Design a protein around this motif. Structure first.
Motif, PDB file in Angstrom:
ATOM      1  N   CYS A  96      30.788  46.921  64.918  1.00 17.92           N
ATOM      2  CA  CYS A  96      30.543  45.634  64.295  1.00 17.92           C
ATOM      3  C   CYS A  96      30.121  44.562  65.289  1.00 17.92           C
ATOM      4  CB  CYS A  96      31.803  45.175  63.560  1.00 17.92           C
ATOM      5  SG  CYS A  96      31.826  43.438  63.090  1.00 17.92           S
ATOM      6  N   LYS A  97      29.050  43.843  64.963  1.00 20.76           N
ATOM      7  CA  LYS A  97      28.586  42.768  65.818  1.00 20.76           C
ATOM      8  C   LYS A  97      28.772  41.438  65.106  1.00 20.76           C
ATOM      9  CE  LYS A  97      24.211  41.846  67.235  1.00 20.76           C
ATOM     10  NZ  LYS A  97      24.492  41.556  65.797  1.00 20.76           N
ATOM     11  N   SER A  98      29.538  40.546  65.716  1.00 24.14           N
ATOM     12  CA  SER A  98      29.778  39.239  65.132  1.00 24.14           C
ATOM     13  C   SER A  98      29.418  38.182  66.151  1.00 24.14           C
ATOM     14  CB  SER A  98      31.242  39.091  64.740  1.00 24.14           C
ATOM     15  OG  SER A  98      31.528  37.746  64.397  1.00 24.14           O
ATOM     16  N   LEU A  99      28.456  37.338  65.799  1.00 28.66           N
ATOM     17  CA  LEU A  99      27.997  36.295  66.700  1.00 28.66           C
ATOM     18  C   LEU A  99      27.517  36.975  67.990  1.00 28.66           C
ATOM     19  CD1 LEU A  99      30.727  33.558  66.078  1.00 28.66           C
ATOM     20  CD2 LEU A  99      28.581  33.943  64.909  1.00 28.66           C
ATOM     21  N   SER A 100      27.996  36.540  69.146  1.00 27.41           N
ATOM     22  CA  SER A 100      27.538  37.173  70.376  1.00 27.41           C
ATOM     23  C   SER A 100      28.325  38.441  70.700  1.00 27.41           C
ATOM     24  CB  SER A 100      27.643  36.191  71.546  1.00 27.41           C
ATOM     25  OG  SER A 100      28.855  35.458  71.494  1.00 27.41           O
ATOM     26  N   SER A 101      29.345  38.729  69.898  1.00 30.31           N
ATOM     27  CA  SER A 101      30.198  39.888  70.129  1.00 30.31           C
ATOM     28  C   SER A 101      29.727  41.234  69.585  1.00 30.31           C
ATOM     29  CB  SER A 101      31.596  39.597  69.592  1.00 30.31           C
ATOM     30  OG  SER A 101      32.574  40.267  70.363  1.00 30.31           O
ATOM     31  N   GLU A 102      29.786  42.245  70.448  1.00 29.81           N
ATOM     32  CA  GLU A 102      29.398  43.614  70.108  1.00 29.81           C
ATOM     33  C   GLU A 102      30.643  44.471  70.291  1.00 29.81           C
ATOM     34  OE1 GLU A 102      26.320  44.247  72.923  1.00 29.81           O
ATOM     35  OE2 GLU A 102      24.800  43.208  71.727  1.00 29.81           O
ATOM     36  N   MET A 103      31.276  44.846  69.189  1.00 23.32           N
ATOM     37  CA  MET A 103      32.496  45.622  69.265  1.00 23.32           C
ATOM     38  C   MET A 103      32.441  46.964  68.551  1.00 23.32           C
ATOM     39  SD  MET A 103      34.374  42.304  67.858  1.00 23.32           S
ATOM     40  CE  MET A 103      33.072  42.329  66.626  1.00 23.32           C
ATOM     41  N   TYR A 104      33.132  47.944  69.119  1.00 27.64           N
ATOM     42  CA  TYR A 104      33.178  49.273  68.539  1.00 27.64           C
ATOM     43  C   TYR A 104      34.200  50.154  69.242  1.00 27.64           C
ATOM     44  CZ  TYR A 104      29.746  49.656  72.372  1.00 27.64           C
ATOM     45  OH  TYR A 104      29.038  49.584  73.542  1.00 27.64           O
ATOM     46  N   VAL A 105      34.760  51.095  68.493  1.00 25.86           N
ATOM     47  CA  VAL A 105      35.738  52.027  69.034  1.00 25.86           C
ATOM     48  C   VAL A 105      34.966  53.182  69.686  1.00 25.86           C
ATOM     49  CG1 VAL A 105      37.533  53.676  68.425  1.00 25.86           C
ATOM     50  CG2 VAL A 105      37.510  51.401  67.384  1.00 25.86           C
ATOM     51  N   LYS A 106      35.196  53.379  70.978  1.00 21.76           N
ATOM     52  CA  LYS A 106      34.508  54.415  71.727  1.00 21.76           C
ATOM     53  C   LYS A 106      35.087  55.809  71.544  1.00 21.76           C
ATOM     54  CE  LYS A 106      33.899  52.375  75.926  1.00 21.76           C
ATOM     55  NZ  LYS A 106      33.465  52.593  77.336  1.00 21.76           N
ATOM     56  N   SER A 107      36.396  55.900  71.348  1.00 24.04           N
ATOM     57  CA  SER A 107      37.042  57.193  71.140  1.00 24.04           C
ATOM     58  C   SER A 107      38.331  56.965  70.379  1.00 24.04           C
ATOM     59  CB  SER A 107      37.316  57.895  72.478  1.00 24.04           C
ATOM     60  OG  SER A 107      38.412  57.325  73.165  1.00 24.04           O
ATOM     61  N   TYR A 108      38.868  58.019  69.778  1.00 25.79           N
ATOM     62  CA  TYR A 108      40.099  57.869  69.006  1.00 25.79           C
ATOM     63  C   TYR A 108      40.750  59.203  68.698  1.00 25.79           C
ATOM     64  CZ  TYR A 108      36.694  59.137  65.395  1.00 25.79           C
ATOM     65  OH  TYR A 108      35.695  59.789  64.697  1.00 25.79           O
ATOM     66  N   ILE A 162      40.883  64.253  71.058  1.00 25.20           N
ATOM     67  CA  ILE A 162      40.236  62.953  71.179  1.00 25.20           C
ATOM     68  C   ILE A 162      38.800  63.050  70.680  1.00 25.20           C
ATOM     69  CG2 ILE A 162      39.228  61.295  72.762  1.00 25.20           C
ATOM     70  CD1 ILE A 162      41.687  61.560  74.500  1.00 25.20           C
ATOM     71  N   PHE A 163      38.480  62.291  69.637  1.00 26.09           N
ATOM     72  CA  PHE A 163      37.134  62.296  69.081  1.00 26.09           C
ATOM     73  C   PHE A 163      36.255  61.261  69.765  1.00 26.09           C
ATOM     74  CE2 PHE A 163      37.894  65.097  65.487  1.00 26.09           C
ATOM     75  CZ  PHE A 163      39.273  65.012  65.319  1.00 26.09           C
ATOM     76  N   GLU A 164      34.973  61.592  69.892  1.00 28.54           N
ATOM     77  CA  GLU A 164      33.991  60.715  70.504  1.00 28.54           C
ATOM     78  C   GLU A 164      33.515  59.743  69.434  1.00 28.54           C
ATOM     79  OE1 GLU A 164      33.131  60.626  73.673  1.00 28.54           O
ATOM     80  OE2 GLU A 164      34.657  62.169  74.016  1.00 28.54           O
ATOM     81  N   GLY A 165      33.616  58.453  69.725  1.00 31.11           N
ATOM     82  CA  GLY A 165      33.212  57.443  68.769  1.00 31.11           C
ATOM     83  C   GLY A 165      31.816  56.878  68.945  1.00 31.11           C
ATOM     84  N   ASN A 166      31.705  55.565  68.774  1.00 35.43           N
ATOM     85  CA  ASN A 166      30.420  54.883  68.861  1.00 35.43           C
ATOM     86  C   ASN A 166      29.969  54.414  70.238  1.00 35.43           C
ATOM     87  OD1 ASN A 166      31.788  54.009  65.959  1.00 35.43           O
ATOM     88  ND2 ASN A 166      29.633  54.628  65.804  1.00 35.43           N
ATOM     89  N   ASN A 192      34.963  48.807  72.974  1.00 31.26           N
ATOM     90  CA  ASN A 192      34.077  47.935  73.709  1.00 31.26           C
ATOM     91  C   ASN A 192      34.321  46.520  73.205  1.00 31.26           C
ATOM     92  OD1 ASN A 192      31.499  47.682  75.476  1.00 31.26           O
ATOM     93  ND2 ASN A 192      31.034  46.514  73.607  1.00 31.26           N
ATOM     94  N   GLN A 193      34.877  45.682  74.083  1.00 24.09           N
ATOM     95  CA  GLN A 193      35.189  44.283  73.780  1.00 24.09           C
ATOM     96  C   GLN A 193      36.418  44.125  72.891  1.00 24.09           C
ATOM     97  OE1 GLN A 193      30.693  42.271  73.862  1.00 24.09           O
ATOM     98  NE2 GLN A 193      32.546  41.247  73.083  1.00 24.09           N
ATOM     99  N   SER A 194      36.327  44.637  71.669  1.00 25.28           N
ATOM    100  CA  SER A 194      37.432  44.547  70.727  1.00 25.28           C
ATOM    101  C   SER A 194      37.485  45.802  69.864  1.00 25.28           C
ATOM    102  CB  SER A 194      37.256  43.322  69.834  1.00 25.28           C
ATOM    103  OG  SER A 194      38.387  42.478  69.905  1.00 25.28           O
ATOM    104  N   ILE A 195      38.652  46.074  69.283  1.00 28.19           N
ATOM    105  CA  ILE A 195      38.833  47.225  68.400  1.00 28.19           C
ATOM    106  C   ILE A 195      38.338  46.819  67.019  1.00 28.19           C
ATOM    107  CG2 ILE A 195      40.512  48.481  67.012  1.00 28.19           C
ATOM    108  CD1 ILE A 195      42.288  48.349  69.673  1.00 28.19           C
ATOM    109  N   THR A 196      37.158  47.288  66.640  1.00 24.95           N
ATOM    110  CA  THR A 196      36.612  46.954  65.329  1.00 24.95           C
ATOM    111  C   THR A 196      36.128  48.217  64.652  1.00 24.95           C
ATOM    112  OG1 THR A 196      35.847  44.784  66.111  1.00 24.95           O
ATOM    113  CG2 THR A 196      34.923  45.610  64.062  1.00 24.95           C
TER     114      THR A 196
END
Length: 159
Positions: free
Chosen positions: A76-88, A112-116, A144-148
């Motif tokens: 998810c990208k909000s304003l200048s923020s680019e966030m995504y879960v890399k693995s889980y 561990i699964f590979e995310g975005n 990346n940045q935040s958990i979204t």
């Protein structure tokens, strides 16, 4: 047994989705757990944890035991923020009280699964063996940045 379970189309209602926490937006409302729906558009269009640590989770209660064969996570990208879960990791439960971590046949360790790698791309992972249960939890491990999150589940009814 590969049809979406209802995250993006609404079959899965808001009440069936909960989380460890969730952030308040610049707009005053919240990045509620039930907003983590695939391809959601809008100001607050995903689930966002209140705190970024490895103790968070998004829970989907399917109401009955089902067969889950795959999952798709999106960022998810909000304003200048680019966030995504890399693995889980994934945990499941039949009653919702005791949780079982997902692992491959003979794993003494959690799978561990590979995310975005971006905020819009779709990353699909298949479950083998499939998961057969009622509650499912996505546990972000790296981000990346935040958990979204924004996701979809695939599977089918059992009998």
């Amino acid at each position: 047994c590969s049809t979406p379970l209802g995250m993006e189309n609404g079959k899965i209602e808001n009440k069936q989705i909960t989380a460890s926490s969730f952030k308040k937006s610049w707009w005053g409302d919240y990045w509620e757990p039930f907003r983590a729906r695939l391809n959601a558009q809008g100001r607050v269009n995903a689930w966002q944890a209140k705190a970024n640590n490895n103790k968070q989770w998004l829970e989907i209660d399917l109401l009955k035991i089902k067969k889950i064969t795959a999952i798709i996570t999106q960022g998810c990208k909000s304003l200048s923020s680019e966030m995504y879960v890399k693995s889980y990791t994934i945990h499941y439960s039949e009653q919702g009280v005791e949780w079982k971590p997902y692992r491959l046949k003979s794993s003494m360790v959690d799978k561990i699964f590979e995310g975005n790698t971006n905020t819009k791309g779709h990353v699909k992972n298949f479950f083998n063996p499939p998961i057969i249960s009622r509650f499912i939890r996505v546990i972000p491990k790296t981000w990346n940045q935040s958990i979204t999150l924004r996701l979809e589940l695939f599977g089918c009814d059992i009998y």
